[model samples]
Target: SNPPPPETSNPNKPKRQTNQLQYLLRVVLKTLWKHQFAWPFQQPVDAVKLNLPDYYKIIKTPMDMGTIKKRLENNYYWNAQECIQDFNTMFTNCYIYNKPGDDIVLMAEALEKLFLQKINELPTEE
Candidate 1:
């Protein structure tokens, strides 16, 4: 037998708030995905095809919009901030891997700027 905690509305109410966070995350990511420079960040980096044997070794955490989208759909993120972290991580990886003048690095910068702008437009609830 198990004892129920003293907390009230612990079942259905949490789902509603998570749904709202998910929606907000979706809106921000959709905007990010629409940018012209988003192609490189849309999927996981191909270390083999790109011929970067050191990609995984250097970039400890590889992130991409496609993977984020999957996490969003699968309810893997607990809050919008987590999604934001992943976005920043993705950009950081780009900066770490590519040189300053590289095109992909430029794209990552551009996309990150757009991402920040879009997320700022959302009402800060907490």
Candidate 2:
């Protein structure tokens, strides 16, 4: 017969590095910012300046890497999935607002791929 263990949680639980997720996200964003195709996504589209009056009509929830960086700076992300969702929104907005073969669309797509690749590299519970 096996003996029952003590009815207590882990006694040797490691101290959580509270900001590890923030640090990882920041480093990943830094890498993304350096990518050639990432230029198009560096900031939100200036519809008035760019003269695309209808830009906001199609893409209602616009997002950009710059905004995400600001959010990360302010500790807005509660989890990696929340941060990743914004990136997805940015790319989805690009896809919705532009034609399939448009240069910006292509860049956004490539950037999206790179972002996902980096995200997948993060350690997860699974």
Cα deviation at 103, candidate 1, in Å, is 0.3
Could you give me the TM-score of model 1 versus the true structure?
0.79
lDDT of 1 by residue, 5-120 (tens): 11222233333246436555567788788888888777788777778888887877778888877666656655677778888888888888888989988888888888778777
Number of the top-ranking candidate, with TM-score as the measure: 1
TM-score of each: 0.79, 0.77
Clashing pairs for model 1 are: none
* Whole-model lDDT values for every prediction: 0.72, 0.70
Per-prediction tally of clashes: 0, 0
| Deviation (Å) of 11 in candidate 1 | 16
What is residue 89's positional error in candidate 2, in angstroms? Answer: 0.3
